[PDB]
Structure 1
Amino acid sequence: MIINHNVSAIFAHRTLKSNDANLSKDIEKLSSGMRINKAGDDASGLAVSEKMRTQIA
């Protein structure tokens, strides 16, 4: 057994961070109530919507 390096742990920890990244965004959406909040969720979605908000204003 390769005792120095734990490959199955390396696969697991990255997989854990992937679900952690997914988990943290869902908390943001529920805390705010909007699917797109910051830059990164959708480049066009934030851009297209912002025109409607000012038009509504």
Structure 2
Amino acid sequence: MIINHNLAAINSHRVLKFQNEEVSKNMEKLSSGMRINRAGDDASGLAVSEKMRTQVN
């Protein structure tokens, strides 16, 4: 076996980190209590929510 590189380890690390990113996103979504906390989740939805907030105020 090629001991100069652990390709399976690299793949596992990659998928683990890209799952950790999603779990962090879900954790922050849970903590904030709002579906759209940061921007970019949906720009149209964020803008609509902002102007409806203005309307209710």
Report the TM-score when normalising by structure 2: 0.87
Answering whether residue 32 of structure 2 is matched by residue 13 of structure 1, we say no
The residue identity in structure 1 corresponding to 2:36 is I
- Counterpart-to-counterpart distance in 2, 1:24 and 1:45: 22
Structure-2 separation of matches of 1:10 and 1:40: 29
User: What is the CA distance between 1:25 and its match in structure 2?
Assistant: 0.9
Q: What TM-score results when the alignment is normalised by the length of structure 1?
A: 0.87
Counterpart-to-counterpart distance in 2, 1:29 and 1:47? 18
Question: Percent identical across equivalent pairs?
Answer: 72
Q: Which structure 2 residue ranges, 5 or more long, are not aligned?
A: none
1:23 correspondence with 2:23 = yes
**1:55 — aligned with what?**
55
